[PDB]
């Protein structure tokens, strides 16, 4: 009941070597669909999902331009920010951005946004009202002042409320086969004995999609998350996701712990325990 379209831009300066490398990437939910990289042969916006080789040449030609347009914008921004903080020419620097829209399943825009980071630290961001900006320091304050004068916020807003939402919709259709398809988790539990005398129970969820999932180790029928170790969901490499959750348990109690895996692909949640054989 919620989807989104996001564009991520990045520019990294190359001291003494010419122009910054610039990359633009587009996502529909967590699926990359378009990508631009100035390190390329002939920098062009290219598709990154099968369902994108349908858009016409007019799409690629247009999107490639807007990308190249942004690339020049970031080439100069890098210089401006370097002036703002009085940095020298020997240092490499980064500028990142992320704009997009979240859209309910009833077609309503849930939230629009556009946020910056210079050298990994927040810089300026368009508030949720789509009208005012939040600036991290003075530099981003200089920028905020230019954008209020030019009423820039009003353009992003128009975009986010219209074009962003319309194209998110188009992209859903093009790729419903893969974007709106539920791929369930395979769940199993492993045992790794500790030298402390007790044991670590590990619960793994394999080959699932999307990626939103909840692993919960419970005892006797009650939750246990302030003391449950986790790994960040990792990509399996074939387009699925996987994750593990572990708790330390006392020897002889293994069987009193279950792992609940909740996921869109599962009709009812999974209850998985240790199974020595």
């Amino acid at each position: 009941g919620s989807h989104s379209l996001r564009y991520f831009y990045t520019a990294v300066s190359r001291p003494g070597l010419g122009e910054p490398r610039f990359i633009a990437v587009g996502y529909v939910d967590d699926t990359e669909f378009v990508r631009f990289d100035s390190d390329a042969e002939n920098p062009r916006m290219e598709p990154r999902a099968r369902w994108m080789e349908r858009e016409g040449p007019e799409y690629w030609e247009q999107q490639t331009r807007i990308a190249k347009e942004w690339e020049q914008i970031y080439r100069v921004d890098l210089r401006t920010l370097r002036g703002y903080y009085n940095q020298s020419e020997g240092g490499s620097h980064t500028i990142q951005e992320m704009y997009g829209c979240d859209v309910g399943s009833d077609g309503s825009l849930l939230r629009g946004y556009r946020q910056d980071a210079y050298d990994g630290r927040d810089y300026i961001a368009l508030n949720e009202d789509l009208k005012t900006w939040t600036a991290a320091d003075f530099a981003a304050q200089i920028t905020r002042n230019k954008w209020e004068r030019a009423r820039y916020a009003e353009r992003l807003r128009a975009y986010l409320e219209g074009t962003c939402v319309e194209w998110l919709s188009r992209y859903l259709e093009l790729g419903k086969e893969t974007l709106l398809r539920s791929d369930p988790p395979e769940a199993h539990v492993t045992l790794h004995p500790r030298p402390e005398g007790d044991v670590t129970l590990r619960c793994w969820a394999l080959g699932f999609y999307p990626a939103d999932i909840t692993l919960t180790w419970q005892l006797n029928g009650e939750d246990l998350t302030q003391d449950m170790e986790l790994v960040e969901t990792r990509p399996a490499g074939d387009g699925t996701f996987q994750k593990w959750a572990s708790v330390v348990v006392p020897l002889g109690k293994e069987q009193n712990y279950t792992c609940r895996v909740e996921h869109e692909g599962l009709p009812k949640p999974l209850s998985q325990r240790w199974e020595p054989l």
Binding site: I66, D77, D116, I124, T143, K146, W147, Y152, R155, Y159
Partner: peptide, 9 residues
């Protein structure tokens, strides 16, 4: 489809 009416910092 990207936003095109950009502005500089």
């Amino acid at each position: 489809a990207q936003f095109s009416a950009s502005a500089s910092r």
